Amino acid sequence: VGSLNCIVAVSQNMGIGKNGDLPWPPLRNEFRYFQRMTTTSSVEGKQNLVIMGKKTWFSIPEKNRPLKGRINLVLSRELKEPPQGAHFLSRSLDDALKLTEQPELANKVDMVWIVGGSSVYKEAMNHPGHLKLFVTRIMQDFESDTFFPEIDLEKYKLLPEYPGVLSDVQEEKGIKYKFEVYEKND
Ligand SMILES: NC(=O)C1=CN([C@@H]2O[C@H](COP(=O)(O)OP(=O)(O)OC[C@H]3O[C@@H](n4cnc5c(N)ncnc54)[C@H](OP(=O)(O)O)[C@@H]3O)[C@@H](O)[C@H]2O)C=CC1
Ligand SMILES: CCc1nc(N)nc(N)c1C#CCc1cccc(-c2cncnc2)c1
Ligand SMILES: [Cl-]
Ligand SMILES: [Cl-]
Ligand SMILES: [Cl-]
Ligand SMILES: [Cl-]
Ligand SMILES: [Cl-]
Ligand SMILES: [Mg+2]
Ligand SMILES: [Mg+2]
Ligand SMILES: [Mg+2]
């Protein structure tokens, strides 16, 4: 693996979570964007790998676990085996990436997508090498108990436009949001 992707939706006050769910009501097209980005693989015969924290895993409805069309990996320092339905378990992002180089996963994984939560994003965003951050800016404040840290512009640059990503402000259920893409190379 020579690149990593993070994907997140964040409120104006840096919120990503509230009481084990999203702080905002469901945005259907925003979710489909999340599906499309994480699921779409450019290589026939391979699937993308999604990496998530334990709480995020259990935030997904049982009937939708594991995430279809993707290899589901859960991070935990406490679990000794993957939770029911999950394909893999690792104690760290580095361990997870290494696992991709093992016989089981060799030639099976295309892109790697980190889908939260907070601590998973923090580790991933400091990981060396090329990294893209797909950040949906929900353009209003929402009550939250889980947050996304401000992006270090010393490392990351906001890309002005991007292929496959809409640039204009979007609106669903009266809520305005915008798709952003950040990138670092080192
Ligand atoms: N808006 C968005 O884009 C998203 C929102 N969310 C929301 O956020 C909330 C959940 O996120 P959050 O509270 O941050 O919880 P997490 O999903 O990050 O789960 C935390 C647990 O995951 C394990 N873990 C996390 N980071 C690491 C790491 N770096 N290395 C090894 N293990 C790790 C640890 O498990 P252990 O205790 O077993 O060691 C930790 O206790 C939910 O409400 C969810 O809806 C989540 C993803 C995206
Ligand atoms: C709409 C959620 C979203 N948008 C973007 N741009 N990035 C994200 N990381 C997220 C998110 C989230 C939480 C999450 C993570 C993984 C799976 C799911 C999920 C929730 N409900 C049904 N299927 C999957 C929910
Ligand atoms: Cl759509
Ligand atoms: Cl999905
Ligand atoms: Cl390819
Ligand atoms: Cl428009
Ligand atoms: Cl609307
Ligand atoms: Mg733009
Ligand atoms: Mg606009
Ligand atoms: Mg548009």
Domain residue spans in the chain?
Answer: 1-186
Could you identify the atom of ligand 1 that is nearest to the CA of residue 75? 32
Cα angle for residues 123, 48, 41 (degrees, 5° grid): 130
- The number of residues in the chain equals 186
| The residue type at 103 | P
Resolution for the entry shown, Å:
1.8
| Region 1-186: CATH code | 3.40.430.10
Q: How far apart are CA 111 and CA 40, in angstroms?
A: 9
User: For ligand 2, which residues put their CB under 6 angstroms from it?
Assistant: 7-9, 30-31, 34, 52, 56, 59-61, 64, 67, 115-116, 136
| C-beta neighbour count of 167 within 10 angstroms | 12
Radius of gyration of the chain (CA): 16
Q: Whose CA is nearest to atom 13 of ligand 2?
A: 56
Task: Identify the three-state secondary structure at position 69.
Answer: coil
Experimental method: X-ray
Q: Is 13 annotated as a binding residue?
A: no
Q: How far apart are CA 75 and CA 93, in angstroms?
A: 7
For 95, list phi and psi in degrees, rounded to 5: -60, -40
Query: What residues have CB less than 8 Å from 114, skipping those under 6 apart?
Result: 4, 5, 6, 7, 50, 51, 52, 93, 120, 121, 124
Query: What residues have CB less than 8 Å from 3, skipping those under 6 apart?
Result: 111, 112, 129, 130, 131, 132
For 54, list phi and psi in degrees, rounded to 5: -70, -40
